[PDB]
Design an enzyme around this catalytic site. Sequence first.
Site, PDB file in Angstrom:
ATOM      1  N   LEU A  57       1.024  -1.199   0.068  1.00 47.28           N
ATOM      2  CA  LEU A  57       0.253   0.111   0.289  1.00 47.28           C
ATOM      3  C   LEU A  57       0.789   1.093  -0.002  1.00 47.28           C
ATOM      4  CD1 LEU A  57      -2.609  -0.802   2.601  1.00 47.28           C
ATOM      5  CD2 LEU A  57      -2.656  -1.084  -0.467  1.00 47.28           C
ATOM      6  N   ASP A 111       7.637   9.474   9.119  1.00 49.00           N
ATOM      7  CA  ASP A 111       8.618  10.439   8.218  1.00 49.00           C
ATOM      8  C   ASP A 111       7.798  11.999   8.321  1.00 49.00           C
ATOM      9  OD1 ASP A 111       6.726   9.214   6.281  1.00 49.00           O
ATOM     10  OD2 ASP A 111       8.405   9.091   5.681  1.00 49.00           O
ATOM     11  N   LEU A 167      -4.531   3.523  -0.828  1.00 46.67           N
ATOM     12  CA  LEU A 167      -6.305   3.284  -0.171  1.00 46.67           C
ATOM     13  C   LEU A 167      -6.981   4.516  -0.915  1.00 46.67           C
ATOM     14  CD1 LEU A 167      -5.146   3.264   3.363  1.00 46.67           C
ATOM     15  CD2 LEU A 167      -6.297   1.668   1.776  1.00 46.67           C
ATOM     16  N   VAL A 215      -1.412  11.023   3.315  1.00 50.13           N
ATOM     17  CA  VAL A 215      -0.622   9.875   3.751  1.00 50.13           C
ATOM     18  C   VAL A 215      -0.657   9.745   4.876  1.00 50.13           C
ATOM     19  CG1 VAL A 215       1.921   9.573   3.806  1.00 50.13           C
ATOM     20  CG2 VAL A 215       0.731  10.904   2.254  1.00 50.13           C
ATOM     21  N   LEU A 216      -1.527   8.165   5.081  1.00 50.22           N
ATOM     22  CA  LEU A 216      -2.112   8.536   6.684  1.00 50.22           C
ATOM     23  C   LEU A 216      -0.771   7.617   7.616  1.00 50.22           C
ATOM     24  CD1 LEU A 216      -5.256   8.829   5.616  1.00 50.22           C
ATOM     25  CD2 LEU A 216      -5.536   7.439   6.821  1.00 50.22           C
TER      26      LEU A 216
END
EC number: 2.1.1.221
Length: 193
Positions: free
Chosen positions: A105, A129, A151, A164-165
């Site tokens: 992912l 990060d 996703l 960006v989880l």
Amino acid sequence: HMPRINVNQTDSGIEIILDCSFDELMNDKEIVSLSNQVTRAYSANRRANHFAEIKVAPFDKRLKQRFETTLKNTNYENWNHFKFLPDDKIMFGDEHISKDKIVYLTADTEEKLEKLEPGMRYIVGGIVDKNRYKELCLKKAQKMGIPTRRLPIDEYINLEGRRVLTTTHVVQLMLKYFDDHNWKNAFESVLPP
Ligand SMILES: Nc1ncnc2c1ncn2[C@@H]1O[C@H](CSCC[C@H](N)C(=O)O)[C@@H](O)[C@H]1O
């Protein structure tokens, strides 16, 4: 030992690998954040109506050191449905799930995930990060020869938000997905609008 669980939970049939091969890329504070994200993933998994088989691989260096010390009394070696592996061999296929059933992912790929499927193994980058290493997981998956998927949640994120989880938010979202098979509802459960 004796963890608290959702006694009604059932197996989603998927595996999730937290790919923790990025020790050297993080500072000390970020290794802390990561360890806590791992413990939160476990909490989400125990609570979820549908659990996954989660693996941390490789489990090494400062992350491992922190578990052996500050988090020693979590009893991580005995966690329910949540395992710690010494290397990354699981990402290239094993006896339970073969290579043609593994997806990495990443937010940086075009192709959207349609669904999560029993018998598949999904790899999530174990790195804190704040997306400073641009396209890191995308390029790595390419090198490993593993297909990439993003996703299907960008429809639910406005420009001003974070697409960006975190590692743990991804796991939480993936678990919530199995409740109804509805990505929007799973997203809204994990990241309230
Ligand atoms: N929108 C999204 N689609 C697919 N995977 C995502 C995502 N947001 C976060 N992730 C996953 O969660 C992990 C933590 S975010 C780490 C970002 C890192 N620079 C990278 O290149 O991936 C990522 O490695 C990725 O596996």
